């Protein structure tokens, strides 16, 4: 439900206030049962996540255990690998920036705890190129850990071998995709591959590979070291566990709090963070999972709590759980319009739907903000939207269509008036 | 996306990794599996950018040589990513985040202030070559929606006057306290932490026999 206890808050060093470095980490006791866990077995680790029923902490939601289970199949003579994507291009995902800037070890032991679960030879962490600062913090942390012998061959005084590496991103949101990151590592252009060859079977350097949101890798060790069931209790049904929530825009105290999942949307701005700037009635709309997920208008805001099942009932996605809030002084139409501008400046262009479709919606959306376009065009953008939604090679085209669909779904009268406003002044 | 050879930006310019740089080069390679030096392109191309911001056609060709890859390969990587600059950026490259999260926090409000202070249009270098302003997209520090990235400095919660203090510090002197401004630090509920105030539970706590 809500009011996650500090005693249950995984990322204790959030907000810093501790030594993100190892000695702070030791007081955190992050490396407490690592040898034991690995000793227990890879099968024991996946039992822990299956019991946890953790969902993907990245924009896509899938059982974390089943995804890791897939490349637990016997090696075919190719080294298995771990890829941690610290890229978070999605607006409002400062969620991950926290775990690299702070509590970097949380992720380092997440990597080896996760590594033996998939039997990965090594893990590469792709941080956003922008986070040069963040990249500096982690390898200082990674360097500490090996010096200790926590990672490396015979890591944590155990038979198992692991090596952790950090890879420089280069300002691309699409590099965040499950497969495209792999291609970026491989050194080719960051263009996603098709799903038929699933990442596990075909991978980074053509070997089995797996990709996890940094939050997903980070919570593993604590979910196993601590009781996974313990975590499970926090979640709701399929939904489970605490996921960091970032609230940004039109709220009195924008902040990232790792409060519990399944939180009433009205409650998290009202109780933690900062109540919606201007009052809870000054809420034109809420973007729950970030730019990719459709915004939900106030009417439904207070009604649904934050969890992926509840949101999909609501037609929106928990995604990165980045809450972007809009007051009534905003231009709903120009707000979403810049997100389509966010996607035309960013989609790879590999696939026909997304390439021309996202540019086509950008042109129509800019006209919509001006009000130059006629009212009949508004549903035509509906139809352009679903052509892009099911036909794209990756999910970004999936993502571009949803905000457009949300604007037409709940704010169709406002766009018509902008249509009307321009027609009147001629 | 076409490199029309120009006396300044052309193959004529000689590029070569400093003895120190070449060292760095190798370090990167080994990170990748053997015989996969190809992957070194992005990281290496980045060090060519570290060497020189311009990174001219000559520099890319050099990268191809070092990693043994086909030049077109490197050319494709450089063009795809915004991080690499194929034109001479200014000494201080100021990038203002203008995605919706920041906009709603008047990120644009920052823009107008910076254009006037630099006294220049958005997208080009100052005559002084001192600063270069560009309207970049989300930088991943939405919590502090007002935000500008100055050569990694990554400042935040910036207000016209805040940027004012910052731009003056860059123009005279250096290292202008890069980071947030209001003192909200990184993602602190401004009013109060409201959480994590309780002391760390300590190692062992909650193990619950896993």
């Amino acid at each position: 439900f809500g009011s996650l206890k500090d005693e249950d808050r995984i990322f204790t060093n959030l907000y810093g206030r501790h030594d993100w470095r190892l000695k702070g980490a030791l007081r955190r006791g992050d490396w407490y049962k690592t040898k034991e866990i690995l000793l227990k077995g890879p099968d024991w680790i996946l039992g822990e996540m299956k019991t946890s029923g953790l969902r993907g902490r990245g924009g896509a939601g899938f059982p974390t255990g089943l995804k890791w289970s897939f490349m637990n199949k016997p090696s075919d003579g190719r080294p298995k690998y771990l890829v941690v994507n610290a890229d978070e291009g999605e607006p409002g995902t400062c969620k991950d920036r926290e775990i690299m800037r702070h509590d970097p070890h949380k992720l380092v032991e997440g990597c080896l705890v996760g590594g033996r679960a998939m039997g990965a030879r090594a893990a590469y962490i792709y941080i956003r190129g922008e986070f040069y600062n963040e990249a500096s913090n982690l390898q200082v942390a990674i360097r500490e850990a090996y010096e200790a012998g926590l990672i490396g061959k015979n890591a944590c005084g155990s038979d198992y071998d692991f090596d952790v590496f950090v890879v420089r991103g280069a300002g691309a949101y699409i590099c965040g995709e499950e497969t495209a990151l792999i291609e970026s590592i491989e050194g080719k252009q960051g263009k996603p591959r098709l799903k038929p060859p699933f990442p596990a079977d075909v991978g980074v350097f053509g070997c089995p590979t797996t990709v996890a949101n940094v939050e997903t890798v980070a919570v593993s060790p604590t979910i196993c070291r601590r009781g996974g069931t313990w975590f499970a209790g926090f979640g709701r049904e399929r939904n489970s566990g605490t996921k960091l929530f970032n609230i940004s825009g039109h709220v009195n105290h924008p902040c990232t709090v790792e409060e519990e999942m399944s939180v009433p949307l009205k409650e998290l701005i009202e109780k933690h963070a900062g109540g919606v700037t201007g009052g809870w009635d000054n809420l034109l709309a809420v973007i729950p999972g970030g730019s990719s997920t459709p915004l939900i208008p106030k009417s439904v805001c207070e009604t649904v709590l934050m969890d992926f099942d509840a949101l999909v009932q609501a037609q929106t996605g928990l995604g990165t759980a980045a809450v972007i809030v809009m007051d009534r002084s905003t231009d709903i139409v120009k707000a979403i319009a810049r997100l389509i501008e966010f996607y035309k400046h960013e989609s790879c262009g590999q696939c026909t739907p997304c390439r021309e479709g996202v540019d086509w919606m950008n042109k129509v959306m800019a006209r919509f903000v001006k009000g130059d376009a006629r009212p009949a065009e508004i549903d035509s953008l509906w139809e352009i939207s679903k052509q892009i939604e099911g036909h794209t090679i990756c999910a970004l085209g999936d993502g571009a269509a949803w905000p457009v669909q949300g604007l037409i779904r709940h704010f169709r009268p406002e766009l018509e008036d902008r249509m009307q406003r321009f027609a009147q002044q001629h | 996306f076409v490199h029309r050879d120009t006396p300044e930006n052309n193959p004529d310019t000689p590029f070569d990794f400093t003895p120190e740089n070449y060292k760095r080069i190798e370090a990167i390679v080994k990170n990748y599996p053997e015989g996969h030096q190809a992957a070194a392109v992005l990281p290496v191309l980045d060090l060519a950018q570290r060497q020189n911001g311009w990174l001219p056609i000559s520099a890319m060709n050099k990268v191809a040589e070092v990693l043994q890859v086909p030049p077109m390969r490197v050319y494709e990587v450089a063009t795809f990513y915004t991080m690499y600059n194929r034109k001479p950026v200014g000494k201080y490259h100021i990038q203002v985040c203008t995605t919706t999260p920041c906009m709603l926090r008047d990120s644009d409000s920052i823009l107008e202030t910076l254009q006037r202070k630099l006294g220049i249009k958005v997208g080009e270098t100052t005559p002084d070559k001192l600063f270069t302003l560009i309207e970049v997209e989300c930088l991943g520090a939405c919590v502090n929606a007002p935000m500008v990235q100055i050569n990694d400095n990554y400042y935040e919660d910036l207000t016209p006057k805040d940027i004012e203090e910052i731009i003056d510090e860059l123009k005279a002197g250096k290292v202008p306290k890069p980071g947030p401004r209001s003192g909200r630090f990184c993602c602190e509920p401004a009013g109060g932490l409201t959480s994590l105030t309780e002391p760390p539970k300590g190692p062992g706590f909650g193990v619950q026999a896993g």
């Binding site: 090596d163 350097f205 | 990167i28 570290r50």
Partner: peptide
Amino acid sequence: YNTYTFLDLNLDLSKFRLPQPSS
């Protein structure tokens, strides 16, 4: 921090990294 510090950390963690497989 400086432009070359991230890669120098890599320069340093080279030894830390054990050997890499070859195809």
